[PDB]
């Protein structure tokens, strides 16, 4: 009842591109042409249509046709699917290239009994697919280069002995995107050829026999992926782009016409954050605060990013129209930091992962943000589902840093900033299975060019249920708390520049949350048994809310295996138990640290919050690890985590000392001296203070890279010996 729509869809498109012009009562020859083109993936025909192509089923010497009247002696001599040279006016198929593509097929009685012709026809169709269609959306590409390479560098040469020419066979190294750059026709042939073998039922088995990797590709591509190709092709068409924009503009017409003034004011301040105003900041500053603002070398501290540094710095300039540093001021600045933040709603949601009630900001602003959010939530009430259309893809241009600053640091090739580093790419695609949107996604109806720092191009498949708001500029504002499943990640070329296309499908946030919850439950069964804790204890927690969601979860495991394989099993158990006894937690999250209870719950003042890659909270006996960022030159998260476990070791040892109080062993005079001496030998960060030095040192000593283990030994021996004492002390005592 739904397959028939497909046959229905066929006849439709046929009506156009398929034009018969024969002698032998067309009713038959035509019937044959339908049975032949019926084997070809429906969407390839609509794509051919989209680019103005046409299929002509004529009689006799094919070159004896209007469309082929102009063919140049060179393009009059072809080569069949097998490489055998032929003469056009003697063959039965030909696909004319150009800004007015032509497919001419010689009307023959049988194409069934003749598995050879059919193969060739499909080969010229495949040639159309790769050369005339895919080429308009920059493909085949890297994904295909992969199938090609797998074929050659595979021990079984029979793969090559079927799809590659000798030109490809000889080529030494793998085929790089560069190769393809100046060999498009080469790849297109192979593509076309494999498409051919696949399409023609008889030669399909052969493909799957000697070139499985190829079969697979062409299989997946024709059974699904292709439809996305058609989608991208359409996105290139001006009229298609606008026909789409209109239907949607229409589906939300009432919603818009009825939208109030305030309504628009909200949608507006949600797209462009309000920066803090001097006349207010200055005005707010208490008498002493305002005064104290003059003895400050703002550039002194660190918790103030350059933007903030400069901003603050210009506050003096207005006050001057008149007549390191202490911690009382350090306090003053930790206070102003909060006040000089832009009022950025979506930002607020991302940072809190949706917990808009977090006491990580001053009550009044917390409230101001809640009011507006509860409102936008009310405004974005009408769902996208409509009778004006079915599947609807929306696009979003994203910055890799938003998901993982660490990989984002080496995403673009440093020699050619137009290419994407296959290395970081692979690592980035690795465990990216699901994503979550805690703030309002602002997507485009039709895909648009990106910004420089944006090398991520999302193609999202909305659910009819998904609510959204329409913007005049052709952008939709989706409702918060969306669930997204990653369906495909690949490298693509667009505008002589490489991008990572992410193909995602919207699903119920709960479905994703359940996965997170099931995982957190699983990870404890495992590490409770390893560490030997009570079967049902809650040690590790996944506080995952943002877009690189699944990853946070999959890296927690790996982080721990590292933690394990580098530190003494008995040190792990002794300290870990200490933590559990105090309800401690290993928190892996993607929301900024000042929004994790484990830290804010035990805060004195709010301005005393810390956001970083890692953090240890004695009061909660928990270790927090923020995944989306990049630790100050930490190779990876494993290290940062261990560094924190150092602060934990410091916290237990000190306790074992004088059990009557929670003091750090890193505070003992004996250590305050080792630090005063060797405390400048290891990482600069270690130079901060004893606790950080102890941890920095503790970390290097347990690095997966011994080169680093040696550094401590021959640079901070007095320390390397200290830490090792503390290790035995804890292990035994």
């Amino acid at each position: 009842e739904r397959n028939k729509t497909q046959e229905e869809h066929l006849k439709e498109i046929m009506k156009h591109i398929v034009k018969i012009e024969v002698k032998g009562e067309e009713a038959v020859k035509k019937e044959a042409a339908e049975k032949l083109l019926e084997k070809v993936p429906s969407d390839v025909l609509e794509m051919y249509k989209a680019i103005g192509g046409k299929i002509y089923i004529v009689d006799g010497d094919i070159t004896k046709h209007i469309s082929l009247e102009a063919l140049s002696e060179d393009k009059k001599k072809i080569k069949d699917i097998y490489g055998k040279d032929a003469l056009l006016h003697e063959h039965y198929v030909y696909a004319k290239e150009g800004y007015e593509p032509v497919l001419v097929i010689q009307s023959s009685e049988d194409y069934v009994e003749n598995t050879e012709k059919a193969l060739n026809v499909y080969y010229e169709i495949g040639k159309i697919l790769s050369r005339d269609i895919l080429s308009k959306i920059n493909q085949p590409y890297q994904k295909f280069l992969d199938v090609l390479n797998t074929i050659k560098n595979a021990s079984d040469s029979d793969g090559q002995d079927l799809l590659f020419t000798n030109q490809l066979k000889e080529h030494p190294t793998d085929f790089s995107v560069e190769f393809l750059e100046q060999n498009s026709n080469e790849v297109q042939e192979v593509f076309a050829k494999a498409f051919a073998y696949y399409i023609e039922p008889q030669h399909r088995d052969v493909l799957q026999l000697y070139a499985p990797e190829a079969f697979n590709y062409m299989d997946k591509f024709n059974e699904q992926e292709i439809n996305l190709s058609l989608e991208e092709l359409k996105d290139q068409r001006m009229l298609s782009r606008y026909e789409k924009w209109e239907k949607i503009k229409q589906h939300y017409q009432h919603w818009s016409d009825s939208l109030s003034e305030e309504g628009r004011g909200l949608l507006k301040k949600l797209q462009i954050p309000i920066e803090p105003k001097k006349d207010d900041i200055i005005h707010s500053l208490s008498q002493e605060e305002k005064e104290l603002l003059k003895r400050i070398q703002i550039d002194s501290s660190d918790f103030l990013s350059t933007e903030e540094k400069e901003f603050l710095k210009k506050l003096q300039i207005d006050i001057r129209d008149s007549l390191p540093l202490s911690e009382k001021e350090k306090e003053f600045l930790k206070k102003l930091k909060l006040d000089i933040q832009p009022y950025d709603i979506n930002q607020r949601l991302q940072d809190t992962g949706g917990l808009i009630d977090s006491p990580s900001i001053n009550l009044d602003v917390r409230k101001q943000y809640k009011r507006d959010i509860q409102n936008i939530d009310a405004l974005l009430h009408q769902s996208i589902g409509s009778t004006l259309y079915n599947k609807i893809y929306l696009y979003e241009n994203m910055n890799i840093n938003n998901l993982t600053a660490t990989l984002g640091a080496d995403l673009v090739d440093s020699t050619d900033n137009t290419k994407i580093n296959r290395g970081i790419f692979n690592e980035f695609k690795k465990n990216f299975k699901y994503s979550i949107s805690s703030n309002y996604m602002i997507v485009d109806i039709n895909e648009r060019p990106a910004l420089d720092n944006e090398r991520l191009k999302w193609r999202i498949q909305l659910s009819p249920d998904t609510r959204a708001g329409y913007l005049e500029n052709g952008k939709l504002i989706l409702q918060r708390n969306i669930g997204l499943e990653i369906k495909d990640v690949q490298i693509i070329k667009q505008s002589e520049k490489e991008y990572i296309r992410i193909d995602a499908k919207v699903v119920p946030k709960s479905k994703i949350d359940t996965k997170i919850q099931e995982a957190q439950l699983n990870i404890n069964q495992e590490w409770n048994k390893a560490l030997g804790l009570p079967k049902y204890t809650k040690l590790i927690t996944f506080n995952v809310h943002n877009r690189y969601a699944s990853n946070i979860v999959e890296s927690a495991y790996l982080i721990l295996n590292e933690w394990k394989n580098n530190i003494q099993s008995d040190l792990i158990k002794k300290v870990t138990n200490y933590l559990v006894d105090g309800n401690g937690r290993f928190v892996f999250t993607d929301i900024t640290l000042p929004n994790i209870a484990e830290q804010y719950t035990h805060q004195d003042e709010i301005y005393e919050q810390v956001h970083s890659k890692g953090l240890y909270v004695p009061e909660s006996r928990s270790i927090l690890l923020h995944g989306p960022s990049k630790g100050v030159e930490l190779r990876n998260d494993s290290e940062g985590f261990i560094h924190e476990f150092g602060h934990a070791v410091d916290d237990y040892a000190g306790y074992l000392l004088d059990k009557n109080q929670s003091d750090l062993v890193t505070n003992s005079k004996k250590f305050i001296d080792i630090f005063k001496e060797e405390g400048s030998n290891l990482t600069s960060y270690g130079r901060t203070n004893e606790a950080e030095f102890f941890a920095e040192a503790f970390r290097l000593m347990h690095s997966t890279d011994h080169a680093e283990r040696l550094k401590v030994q021959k640079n901070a021996p007095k320390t390397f010996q200290f830490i090792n004492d503390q290790i035995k002390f804890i292990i035994n005592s």
């Binding site: 830290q599 953090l615 923020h626 960022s629 630790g631 930490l634 940062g640 410091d650 606790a691 941890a695």
Partner: peptide, 9 residues
């Protein structure tokens, strides 16, 4: 609270 700060975005 003993951290290990990230790198300014």
């Amino acid at each position: 609270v003993y951290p290990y700060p990230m790198e300014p975005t």
